[PDB]
Design a protein around this ligand. Sequence first.
Ligand code: A5A
Length: 488
Amino acid sequence: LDHGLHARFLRGLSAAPDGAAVRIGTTSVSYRHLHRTALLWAGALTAAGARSVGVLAGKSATGYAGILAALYAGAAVVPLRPDFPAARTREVLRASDADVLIADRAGLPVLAGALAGDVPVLAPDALDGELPEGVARLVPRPELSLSEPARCKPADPAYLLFTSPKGVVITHGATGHYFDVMERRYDFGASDVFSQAFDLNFDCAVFDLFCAWGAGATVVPVPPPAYRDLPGFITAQGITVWFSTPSVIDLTRRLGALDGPRMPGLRWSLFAGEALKCRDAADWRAAAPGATLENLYGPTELTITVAAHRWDDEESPRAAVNGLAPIGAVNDGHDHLLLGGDPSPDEGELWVTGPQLAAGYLDPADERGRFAERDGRRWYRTGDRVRRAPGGDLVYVGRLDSQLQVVEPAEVEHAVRACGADDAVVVGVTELVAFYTGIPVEPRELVRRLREVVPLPRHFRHLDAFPLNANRKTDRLRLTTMAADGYG
Ligand SMILES: C[C@H](N)C(=O)NS(=O)(=O)OC[C@H]1O[C@@H](n2cnc3c(N)ncnc32)[C@H](O)[C@@H]1O
């Protein structure tokens, strides 16, 4: 089992071959059935010489098997979003130099557009007349099926993932170090049931898949209606491990769904992608009291997550800064610094180096200003302002470049929440606009409260919800435009 990332799936296969690898609605696909499908598809990918495989698919059997088939063929997985604009998907195919495309039924309608810039398509569910004319089809033959998955070197690409817009090359070796280190934090086993909440083109979906599969556990895609009541969905499905952006907490709370211990069977409550508020952690924890909660942090260029904090109902609120839970300690095997060009013991840009470094970007020229040399080593400059609490825990404060002159928006946001908002986004237009959710407050009352907690924005906007970007993060760029249009 030295194959690479996909060796995690082989370990599940060995532990629960006939157990459910993926549960899609009212049906399951077994490890064994995914394995054989991937061997079959990989034989076709191998015969066509595939080094990079576009996976143009949703949360379908085809899409999960397509990921595995790509890895089984020794190729990088290049996830493509069927619901993304076709022209964007064209750019990604060009940039990644994808050799083959695997498409499910959600991918078919976008495929004519996707291929309108030599790239055969493996689309099991399609009829011939459903592929655009010109496009050659990969029809996997059982006689060319591999007898076993390709074995890859730690340097080989496993995944090509795009940030929000550069292509990041994630290696087998880096995911190998990642899962080795994350597995040791947890107690996953074959009876666990993992959410699959992240989109397939977002790096955290790799944790969903390979932590579950590494344990012989079951992956359960979270369909969009489920967000009307996440705790109901978790309990109905017997989900033991939950992982998402922490926006789902305020969402669930707002809908009245976060009242009482509605998730008794949950064991792990994991959040990544944006700042986690203390208050949000404690609220989720009351709703899922038998689940350990963790705040997981990191950028795509450091393989999935690169720091972790295990929430403690008593200690974490003490270490909190600006109402935000700590991001904790960097993953084992990594060093970090907080730079001001001089290191600080207290606060600065977080720089990290270690085995989880991406191999780099699809265009090396993009590395400059992002990857950096220091003390003979290669680091990733996160562009995040991070503080060290007493205790040693790191705490994320904000984007390094968010500072203004009129000011640290994150301190204003914290003051708005201490005055009663569920959440706040403070942006510049130079003056301040403070968007907030929660109970509406007349702005002169909000100012009175803010002068009481911090002895100020000139404009306050109440929203039912912040807008979210493609990754289900607060869309701060959208809000900055809303501010400029309204008050420029
Ligand atoms: C978790 C996933 N690797 C991710 O979100 N990658 S990303 O490249 O899309 O975005 C990374 C940025 O999200 C923010 N972020 C990610 N996880 C976070 C956490 N737990 N707390 C605060 N900020 C976080 C930071 O600004 C970070 O640099």
